[PDB]
Amino acid sequence: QNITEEFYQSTCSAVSKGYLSALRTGWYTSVITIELSNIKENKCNGTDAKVKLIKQELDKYKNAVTDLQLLMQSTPATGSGSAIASGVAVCKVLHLEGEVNKIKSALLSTNKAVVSLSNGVSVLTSKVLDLKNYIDKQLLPIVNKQSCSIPNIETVIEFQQKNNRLLEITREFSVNAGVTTPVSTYMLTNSELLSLINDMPITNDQKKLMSNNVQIVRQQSYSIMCIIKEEVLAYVVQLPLYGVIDTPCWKLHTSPLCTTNTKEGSNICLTRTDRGWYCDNAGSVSFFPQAETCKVQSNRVFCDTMNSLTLPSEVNLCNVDIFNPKYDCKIMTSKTDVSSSVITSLGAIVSCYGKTKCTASNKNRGIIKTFSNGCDYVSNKGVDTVSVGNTLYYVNKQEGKSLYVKGEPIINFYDPLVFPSDEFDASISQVNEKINQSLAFIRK
Amino acid sequence: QNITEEFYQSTCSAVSKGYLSALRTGWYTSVITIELSNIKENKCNGTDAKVKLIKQELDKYKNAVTDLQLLMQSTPATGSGSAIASGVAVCKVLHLEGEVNKIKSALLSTNKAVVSLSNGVSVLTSKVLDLKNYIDKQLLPIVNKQSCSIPNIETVIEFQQKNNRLLEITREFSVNAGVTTPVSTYMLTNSELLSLINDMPITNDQKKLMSNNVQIVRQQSYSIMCIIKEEVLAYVVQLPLYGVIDTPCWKLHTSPLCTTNTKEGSNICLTRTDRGWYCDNAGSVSFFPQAETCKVQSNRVFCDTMNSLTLPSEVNLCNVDIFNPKYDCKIMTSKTDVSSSVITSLGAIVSCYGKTKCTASNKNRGIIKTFSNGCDYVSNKGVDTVSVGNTLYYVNKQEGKSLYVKGEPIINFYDPLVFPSDEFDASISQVNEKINQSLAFIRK
Amino acid sequence: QNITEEFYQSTCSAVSKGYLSALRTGWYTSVITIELSNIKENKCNGTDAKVKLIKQELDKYKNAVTDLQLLMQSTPATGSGSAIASGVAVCKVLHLEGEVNKIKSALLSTNKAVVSLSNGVSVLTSKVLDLKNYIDKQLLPIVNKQSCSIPNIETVIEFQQKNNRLLEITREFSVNAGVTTPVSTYMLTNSELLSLINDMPITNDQKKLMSNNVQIVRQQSYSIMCIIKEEVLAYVVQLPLYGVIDTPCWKLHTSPLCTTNTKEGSNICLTRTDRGWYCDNAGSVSFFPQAETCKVQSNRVFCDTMNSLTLPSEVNLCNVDIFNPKYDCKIMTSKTDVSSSVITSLGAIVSCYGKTKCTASNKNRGIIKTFSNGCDYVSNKGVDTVSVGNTLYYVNKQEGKSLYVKGEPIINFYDPLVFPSDEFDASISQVNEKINQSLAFIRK
Ligand SMILES: *[C@@H]1O[C@H](CO)[C@@H](O)[C@H](O)[C@H]1NC(C)=O
Numbered sequence A, B, C: 001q002n003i004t005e006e007f008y009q010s011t012c013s014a015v016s017k018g019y020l021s022a023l024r025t026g027w028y029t030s031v032i033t034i035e036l037s038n039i040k041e042n043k044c045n046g047t048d049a050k051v052k053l054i055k056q057e058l059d060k061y062k063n064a065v066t067d068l069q070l071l072m073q074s075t076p077a078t079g080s081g082s083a084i085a086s087g088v089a090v091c092k093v094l095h096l097e098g099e100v101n102k103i104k105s106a107l108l109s110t111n112k113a114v115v116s117l118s119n120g121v122s123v124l125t126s127k128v129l130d131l132k133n134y135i136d137k138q139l140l141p142i143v144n145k146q147s148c149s150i151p152n153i154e155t156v157i158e159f160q161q162k163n164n165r166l167l168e169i170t171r172e173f174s175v176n177a178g179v180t181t182p183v184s185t186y187m188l189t190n191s192e193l194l195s196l197i198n199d200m201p202i203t204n205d206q207k208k209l210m211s212n213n214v215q216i217v218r219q220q221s222y223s224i225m226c227i228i229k230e231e232v233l234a235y236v237v238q239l240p241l242y243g244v245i246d247t248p249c250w251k252l253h254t255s256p257l258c259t260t261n262t263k264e265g266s267n268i269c270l271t272r273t274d275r276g277w278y279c280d281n282a283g284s285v286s287f288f289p290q291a292e293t294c295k296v297q298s299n300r301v302f303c304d305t306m307n308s309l310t311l312p313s314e315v316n317l318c319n320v321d322i323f324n325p326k327y328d329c330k331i332m333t334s335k336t337d338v339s340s341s342v343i344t345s346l347g348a349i350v351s352c353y354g355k356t357k358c359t360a361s362n363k364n365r366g367i368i369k370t371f372s373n374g375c376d377y378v379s380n381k382g383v384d385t386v387s388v389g390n391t392l393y394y395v396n397k398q399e400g401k402s403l404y405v406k407g408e409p410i411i412n413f414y415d416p417l418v419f420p421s422d423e424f425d426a427s428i429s430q431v432n433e434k435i436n437q438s439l440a441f442i443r444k
């Protein structure tokens, strides 16, 4: 609840603390059915515009069904099989003879129903749309006569309204080769999603968590097209199960740390690597290197462990002692002293080099801080913007406390002559070993 | 048809074989026309709601036309000119005086027609929508009187249905600066695409191939907005021509290969580079380094040669002898021993290091394999999942045969003291030359 | 207006000149309101289809309002706070008691109106849709009786037309966690955008610039959901302010430059780094490293300075003398001699190595140029395509003048034995210092 931050002047890095986890560790698959009409062409002597409008909407229904049939013949390998493997196993079961008859029997009287498939998966099925009932009762008497009977204009509008969701679902499944994410309101309405969450074999706090973050749940869910067979359209919705909840999470921010000599070509740089989200998980730390894999709402991070690395908990000691022997703190080295800034959760890191004009301003007071050459930091308390060169960044105005941990920039502990300056994935001990090797080649 | 796999224990890499190619090497451009109405405002004494609804839909038609006019004045350079250059050459021809009169004459009696343009391109043109006929015959008598005549509600609904495709096409062309990909059903319906494929100057197996993979064809096609001029809206659809068909294709998978000493800081790593899709092509190999450039359907890969590299066929010998003098097998080196796994076509590579808990399970039996430190592999036969640290991966359940090629991990052939450990783009011979240089600097 | 190009044979790089800048340096926020109906359920004895259709569309209105309410309770941190910080500051003001009453008073008589908020921001507000007027006057008398009165079918269609924009706006704000970019025509119609631009506190040439590039303006704008409160739906549109206009801009193109010895393993390579867009800006140069951050229309580049680096103007001297002491020209080194090509603004760079078949053709004449081993270039005058290996590239047919600046490839000035060949981010002086160090270790 209380967000705090710590800037480390020695390593030009900051850690944003106080975040709570929700890591996806499991999947809950659910079958969504649409009752279809196995209509055949019913051309009759037709002229008045209402029959034409009905026949037009009926052809749009007919093309949607044939499009789903060619879509289910070809199932592309191009999805990420490791993240849809559950639902794909259910679709392979659905292709069995008699399984669609089973779901067809369970949704015979109600819209929602639990169905035990023939593979040990107790899935929750839904009937979200009933087009066979509408077409066979309200439309077929209209095109199964000698001359077509005249339907009312209310029927034309209601049929375009009901048929619309089938057409949009066929559009999403067609452009995405049967696998869509996020899951749209066409695939599952917010009302249907909340009812599906409420009916899940999870704790009540987990139902409240997923119900209060339905948009994040949609962004971390998949919709997989199964089969169109025997007047039934079935597709699987894969919802995330957050097996890791309320564990401490923190975000590491890094920026280049160079020396600030006045003669160009004589400066060396180092930047901590592995910036991103860290969360405590089962005696280890789950690290998320890609920036788009974790959604934050309030102080809660919602990550997928599929794109994480598992690190020893000693990885946090790079934040307290980068020179600590329990974990080899990783860095990259260079000579690229271009000024830059990183907007953190509660402030801004500024790496100012060369002649760059770096400053921090308040909207009404003007410049309140001028950065000197090196790596520095400013909290969001009293600061609105940070300007670096010709770029203006805005500071996050979120409430919290920042702590400036003063310390000597560690780049000053290195003799420039023997520094390894172009290391793209090194470590503190890796650099020290390359330096020990250059001192033995130079002593003789 | 038969998918096979080979895991190389010596290099921590796997090759998935048996795939057939379809590489895009050409473009087939086609002109899609929409007959428009050069209507002018026709405000008359109007009150009843049906005239207002018609006038509202007519203004939505009017804004769509002016939006396309400002869209064709500004053609952004931001597209990738090298992949739309064909259609852009056709749009430059269409801007000539009299060329729209030519297509206007060919689609005078039929919907589809071949047109020889004034630049030597024999394009296939289509009339997919006729709004000038509908507006000038059914709507203008309704707003060209002293007082507007009253149109029936069927006319209001039919006009919103016909005008809809124009409005959606204007939306896609507006948000994408005139160049859209993939090509939506609004740009070209599946029925129109299949008819366009069938009418193409290609072999019958190529028409069957593109017709059975229409969604992949859409994802590898472009729609370019040409011109709105003289009651004609024209835009080019660029369809892929697969000049390379049924050549062997294979997918290389790589994972870090480190030594497993018990003292941290004493281990060295190496990873094969250039993982991805390889296809035999014209006496050479077409390599696709980016992961999203090749769509797989069944055992067929559909790539665009635009994002390929051409390599000598000897590049396959990195799979049989990484130490082979005909091709310099490329690697990258490091000391980053973080555990990870790679899901292949028929199994999983696991690089287990440190204290990470790596295992392979069956859904009902539990843990059936525990990986030791190093790089190892498991087939999908009897394995459902692979757990590495806090992450659970699912194995692809596709049928095929895997071959575990046992061999000494080549990282064990290197003396750690003189190994080059931070090489970001090296080669087997590059590393040996850096080692020969470190042994001459150490012998003295 | 006149686009020119310069190919540097010595460094295998080209510079496309003559482009004019438009850099985003500020934001103009604007409030978009939708007058809503605080209706409550009004179930009455209803049977005929017109009441059902109205009640159905009313439930779609009701769900859209509750979806926006749960959307405004949860505001995700996941947006990029530094680029939405303006609008977020306005939304925080809008959440104050009485501020929605202020905008509700200013849009009491007109659609557009300037409103001075209680935070010093003089925002331009708009009333783009009026659903409270339509529902309370045309719909409530239809469900506030003993038995529902019968509405005409025109009312059903007009209500689905008016309610549609609310439903689409709720869809975009829901899938994107309240922050959408680009800004759709649903968020702001082209007519409303042009009227908002015209009413902006900017010069007349800036109104003409943004009005002639509305699609680029949309792609560089943000729509942020604020609050739904007291029969008012408010959201902020953030439009770009281009503080840098008509400054010279140029695009740097680079390609690998290797030696062409006949014995593999004896060749060294070097590639200039920092390819992309450069624009003169306030006595410095704004560099844009990512490829998708700058949209080009004609000869004008539209960039966001948010994703730029500020460089000394001496960075242009890498184009005139890469060996020039005022700026340390950056390079990367390797031994990866794979053939490739780069399509420039007026031609094509070709790096041909090994046995690769590189050629340049005219559509009707055939092969007009065969590249030898090394880095070379061809203008678009007389050339249509460039083939490298199995890949065919199309040359941009834009009019301009190219200049081939002959010069010795600088890779030939380096002794291969002491060259640093795996540098991932080096510089000309960095390489010379590593060479000076290898010559001192070899002289003894
Ligand atoms: C470098 O030498 C020092 C001095 O003995 C030693 O303490 C340190 O551990 C060495 N570093 C490496 C990486 O071997």
Ligand SMILES: *[C@@H]1O[C@H](CO)[C@@H](O)[C@H](O)[C@H]1NC(C)=O
Binding pocket: B429, B430, B432, B433, B434, B436
């Ligand atoms: C390294 O030296 C050995 C021994 O003569 C030789 O066989 C090998 O080719 C050399 N490697 C390189 C890259 O020069």
Ligand SMILES: *[C@@H]1O[C@H](CO)[C@@H](O)[C@H](O)[C@H]1NC(C)=O
Binding pocket: C429, C430, C432, C433, C434, C436
């Ligand atoms: C390398 O040595 C030469 C010869 O004195 C000198 O001119 C040059 O500046 C040196 N380069 C570096 C990077 O120190």
